[PDB]
Amino acid sequence: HMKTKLFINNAWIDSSDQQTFERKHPVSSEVMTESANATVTDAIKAAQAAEEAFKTWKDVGPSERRRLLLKVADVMESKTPKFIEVMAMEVGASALWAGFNVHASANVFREAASLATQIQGETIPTDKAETLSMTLRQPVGPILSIVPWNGTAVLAARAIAYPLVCGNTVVFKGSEFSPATHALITQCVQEAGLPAGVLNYLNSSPDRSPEIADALISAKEIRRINFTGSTRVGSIIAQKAAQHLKRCLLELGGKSPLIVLDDADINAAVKAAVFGSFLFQGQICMSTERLVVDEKIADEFVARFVEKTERLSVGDPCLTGDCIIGPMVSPNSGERINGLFKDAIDKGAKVVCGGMAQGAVMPATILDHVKSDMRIYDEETFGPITVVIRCKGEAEAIRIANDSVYGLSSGVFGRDINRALRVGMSIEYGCVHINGSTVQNEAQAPYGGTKNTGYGRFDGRAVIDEFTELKWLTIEPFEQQYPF
Amino acid sequence: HMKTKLFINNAWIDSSDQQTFERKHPVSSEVMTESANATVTDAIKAAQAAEEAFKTWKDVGPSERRRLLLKVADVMESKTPKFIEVMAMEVGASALWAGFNVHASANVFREAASLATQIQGETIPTDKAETLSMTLRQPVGPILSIVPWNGTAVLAARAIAYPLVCGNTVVFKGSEFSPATHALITQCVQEAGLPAGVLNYLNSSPDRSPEIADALISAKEIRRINFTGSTRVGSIIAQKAAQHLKRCLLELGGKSPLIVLDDADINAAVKAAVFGSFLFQGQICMSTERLVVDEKIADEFVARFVEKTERLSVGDPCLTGDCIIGPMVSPNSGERINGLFKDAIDKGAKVVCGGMAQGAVMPATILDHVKSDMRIYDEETFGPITVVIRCKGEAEAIRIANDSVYGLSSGVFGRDINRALRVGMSIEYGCVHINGSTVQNEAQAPYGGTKNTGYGRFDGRAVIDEFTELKWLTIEPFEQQYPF
Ligand SMILES: O=Cc1ccccc1O
Numbered sequence: 001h002m003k004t005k006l007f008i009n010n011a012w013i014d015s016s017d018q019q020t021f022e023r024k025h026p027v028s029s030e031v032m033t034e035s036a037n038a039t040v041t042d043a044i045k046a047a048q049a050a051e052e053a054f055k056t057w058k059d060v061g062p063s064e065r066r067r068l069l070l071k072v073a074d075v076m077e078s079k080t081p082k083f084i085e086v087m088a089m090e091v092g093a094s095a096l097w098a099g100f101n102v103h104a105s106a107n108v109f110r111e112a113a114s115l116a117t118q119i120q121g122e123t124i125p126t127d128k129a130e131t132l133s134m135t136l137r138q139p140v141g142p143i144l145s146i147v148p149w150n151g152t153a154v155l156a157a158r159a160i161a162y163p164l165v166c167g168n169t170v171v172f173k174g175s176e177f178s179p180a181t182h183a184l185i186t187q188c189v190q191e192a193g194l195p196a197g198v199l200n201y202l203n204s205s206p207d208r209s210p211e212i213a214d215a216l217i218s219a220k221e222i223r224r225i226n227f228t229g230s231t232r233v234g235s236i237i238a239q240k241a242a243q244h245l246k247r248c249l250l251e252l253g254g255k256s257p258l259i260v261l262d263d264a265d266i267n268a269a270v271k272a273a274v275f276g277s278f279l280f281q282g283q284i285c286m287s288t289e290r291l292v293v294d295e296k297i298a299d300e301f302v303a304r305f306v307e308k309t310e311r312l313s314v315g316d317p318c319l320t321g322d323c324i325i326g327p328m329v330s331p332n333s334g335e336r337i338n339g340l341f342k343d344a345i346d347k348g349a350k351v352v353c354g355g356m357a358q359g360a361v362m363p364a365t366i367l368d369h370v371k372s373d374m375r376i377y378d379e380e381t382f383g384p385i386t387v388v389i390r391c392k393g394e395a396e397a398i399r400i401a402n403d404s405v406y407g408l409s410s411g412v413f414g415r416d417i418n419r420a421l422r423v424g425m426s427i428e429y430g431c432v433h434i435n436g437s438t439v440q441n442e443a444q445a446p447y448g449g450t451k452n453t454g455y456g457r458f459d460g461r462a463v464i465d466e467f468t469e470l471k472w473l474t475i476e477p478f479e480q481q482y483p484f
Numbered sequence: 485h486m487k488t489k490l491f492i493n494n495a496w497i498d499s500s501d502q503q504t505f506e507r508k509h510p511v512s513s514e515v516m517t518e519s520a521n522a523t524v525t526d527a528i529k530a531a532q533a534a535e536e537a538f539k540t541w542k543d544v545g546p547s548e549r550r551r552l553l554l555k556v557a558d559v560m561e562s563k564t565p566k567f568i569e570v571m572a573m574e575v576g577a578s579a580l581w582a583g584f585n586v587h588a589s590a591n592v593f594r595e596a597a598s599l600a601t602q603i604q605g606e607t608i609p610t611d612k613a614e615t616l617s618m619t620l621r622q623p624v625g626p627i628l629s630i631v632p633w634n635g636t637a638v639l640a641a642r643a644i645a646y647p648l649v650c651g652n653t654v655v656f657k658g659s660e661f662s663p664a665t666h667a668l669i670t671q672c673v674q675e676a677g678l679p680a681g682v683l684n685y686l687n688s689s690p691d692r693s694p695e696i697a698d699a700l701i702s703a704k705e706i707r708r709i710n711f712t713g714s715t716r717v718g719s720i721i722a723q724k725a726a727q728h729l730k731r732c733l734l735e736l737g738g739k740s741p742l743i744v745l746d747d748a749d750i751n752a753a754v755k756a757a758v759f760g761s762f763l764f765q766g767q768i769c770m771s772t773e774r775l776v777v778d779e780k781i782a783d784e785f786v787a788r789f790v791e792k793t794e795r796l797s798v799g800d801p802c803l804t805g806d807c808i809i810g811p812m813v814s815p816n817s818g819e820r821i822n823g824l825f826k827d828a829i830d831k832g833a834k835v836v837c838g839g840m841a842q843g844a845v846m847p848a849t850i851l852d853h854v855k856s857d858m859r860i861y862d863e864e865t866f867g868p869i870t871v872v873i874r875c876k877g878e879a880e881a882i883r884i885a886n887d888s889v890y891g892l893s894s895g896v897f898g899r900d901i902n903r904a905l906r907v908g909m910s911i912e913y914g915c916v917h918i919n920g921s922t923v924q925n926e927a928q929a930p931y932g933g934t935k936n937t938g939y940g941r942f943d944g945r946a947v948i949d950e951f952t953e954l955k956w957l958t959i960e961p962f963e964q965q966y967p968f
Pocket residue numbers: 150151152154155283284285286287441
């Protein structure tokens with residue numbers, strides 16, 4: 001099995017207590033990766049390293065930053081087969097999802113690289129004579145980046161590339177389910193030639209995660225925090241950062257809906273539905289978790305959806321290829337889903353395809369006639385399961401979409417685009433896709449949600465404000481008048 | 485004395501329990517204002533009103549928004565003498581500070597008004613064929629705006645004008661020390677012709693403030709929160725908003741320094757020092773609380789500073805004009821200051837001018853040879869007192885400025901501007917003024933701080949993101965390809 005260490009100051013090291021933790025395969029129990037198990041002591045060492053490196057890193061010019069980041073992308077692409085292999089072992093990712101993760105990661109680093117000269121402020125008019133008024137965008141300092149296991153590569157990449165190009169250094173906290181992959185992405189950054197202490201990598205058993213996080217948030221060195229993960233945990237992180245008045249970029253849960261109006265190209269909508277629902281076993285925060293369909297069209301749409309869905313391949317990508325539905329991440333994922341499943345089913349829901357789960361194994365499942373009294377109506381379910389909510393009319397569609405506690409991604413299918421736009425513009429979502437799937441992300445385009453999905457933004461120009469100080473600076477004449 | 489009510493749905497009303505609270509003068513104990521004492525019930529009614537009005541207000545066009553806001557400014561200026569009079573009675577503001585507050589308030593509304601057509605998104609390149617990718621900036625919903633008593637008018641104005649032009653409605657929570665002024669600013673908005681429920685006004689006795697705030701933050705109607713006030717309270721507000729994953733604009737405390745290098749135009753620096761230190765009795769969050777001066781120059785600078793400071797007029801603006809040092813806000817302000825004063829004085833500090841306080845009455849006071857072991861070294865002191873920290877060299881100056889737990893405003897005086905810029909650019913402050921005072925604010929320019937000063941920003945273009953939803957929207961072809 002793979003062996004993985006901590007990374008501080010361009011050095012791969014054991015934890016301060018020489019202790020390890022394992023990532024076992026969720027169905028076979030076979031050890032996939034053994035990782036160094038960081039302590040709080042290690043975490044503080046990581047922050048101190050980041051702080052120290054910041055002293056010179058903040059002054060590195062745009063040309064060098066761009067060159068370095070561009071190189072990271074090149075290096076990540078050069079390691080593509082390893083990423084595919086490791087992601088398949090650790091998080092049951094098919095070659096499709098793994099390969100995409102790499103492309104997306106490399107592209108994030110290139111987009112970030114491109115932004116090097118684009119982190120700009122403004123020169124602003126002032127009534128004051130002989131005075132320059134302007135804004136500057138400067139580096140912040142050490143950033144705490146906490147990254148989950150699902151968008152295994154790209155979620156790390158985004159949480160490194162962007163703070164780097166903004167002149168910051170980062171303490172990267174990886175996932176207990178993905179330690180080989182996160183060590184690997186780190187290694188890529190190392191081989192691109194990033195200065196020592198600019199990127200520091202930590203991973204731990206989940207029993208240690210909270211206190212390691214608390215120590216870093218409470219650490220004077222850490223200036224801002226980005227967190228990607230469950231709303232449940234996100235609130236707790238933000239509550240801690242509030243005790244120290246620290247800004248958070250929160251990238252949390254979703255219940256991303258596909259709105260299928262009575263007008264929809266049913267062929268096209270089914271395709272978007274099948275894709276968005278079951279890519280990476282619905283373990284994407286923006287996976288299509290709802291299909292809100294007009295009653296006039298529902299029966300027909302559901303029939304086609306079910307036909308395609310049943311035909312989808314189930315299996316283990318580390319054992320065999322062409323798996324659409326790989327295993328889930330943990331021998332627990334099905335336990336949560338089944339609780340949601342039973343509740344829905346006892347309240348009138350209808351299994352139109354699939355069945356319940358067991359550990360990390362589940363067939364592609366669709367529930368029809370889901371209603372607002374069922375937990376699964378709005379509770380996020382990280383798995384190859386999705387729900388159909390039927391509705392009557394454009395207004396009720398908007399209502400149902402807007403009644404979610406989340407607001408990450410969404411899709412609206414309708415042949416009348418003027419109409420689709422009305423609903424598209426009225427719904428409370430960070431991402432709206434007119435006649436598109438709910439699973440999209442481009443680096444030029446801001447990525448984030450509203451409500452329980454959090455706040456702040458990765459990607460696009462918007463990510464810059466997340467990792468910069470905005471300073472209002474004036475240059476004034478020596479002689480000026482004062483009231484007293 | 486003045487009598488003040490609550491404001492909900494274009495209606496001035498008593499609180500749900502017909503209870504009142506008073507603003508007594510901090511030295512005479514005479515009743516200045518009697519205000520309706522809002523209950524939690526009133527607060528929820530306010531949010532519901534704001535939510536309901538949002539339904540139509542979000543769709544009001546840019547032309548009408550601009551016209552309306554422009555009118556608010558006109559209306560506020562038409563009420564200038566009343567503002568002067570009321571602010572003098574409630575918060576001991578001189579005509580200088582009151583008059584400025586009005587101008588600044590009117591200008592905020594005009595700047596906000598101007599921005600109506602400037603709340604823009606982007607059309608973004610995409611690799612995808614036959615696809616439009618773009619960002620939209622849309623309204624958020626009901627905003628909770630909590631406003632203190634010091635920048636009595638402009639701090640309210642900023643917390644209304646901006647959320648309004650962004651298409652939001654607001655629950656405005658005013659200050660217990662400034663209920664007549666905050667009711668007045670509300671009245672101005674009413675007379676400009678804002679639709680019912682777009683602005684709703686609440687005030688209460690301080691014993692009720694926390695729970696009224698908690699109810700509003702926990703309220704489903706309230707989408708985002710801006711808070712201006714003490715770091716102490718700001719953390720608590722943010723902790724509450726974290727429990728509901730709500731974004732905060734935090735505008736908190738400061739220990740704003742004036743850096744006087746060995747190079748400085750001492751005449752010019754003294755003038756900036758005198759102004760920034762003692763405007764409105766140093767009750768501005770950006771009041772000059774530190775004078776970091778080079779030892780080579782300190783003795784001379786301190787001598788001039790003391791000369792000017794002693795000559796400053798003390799008195800009560802509601803009784804007599806030309807008062808530079810009015811009374812402080814509460815018969816308690818001096819109790820906090822004296823604790824800070826004694827500590828400094830017992831640890832070697834030197835009163836070069838002034839003396840201790842009593843209730844809300846204090847002479848202009850300067851302490852010299854303040855060192856890092858004294859509480860007053862970095863603790864904010866809301867009063868006509870300020871401290872001198874001596875230093876040796878450009879590096880040590882930056883260190884001392886950067887060692888504050890706050891980072892709101894700052895000034896750097898030096899005849900070599902290249903040098904002044906080095907320190908100016910290296911210090912961790914939201915506002916840096918090269919050869920300028922620490923007390924500046926223009927509506928075109930972003931206003932905010934780093935660290936314990938909070939996060940987020942009023943004024944400038946930056947304020948727009950605070951009160952808008954940023955949505956990534958795509959318009960895609962019907963026919964497109966999917967991997968599975
Ligand atoms: O929802 C999680 C996610 C978002 C963007 C890219 C990859 C991902 O797994």
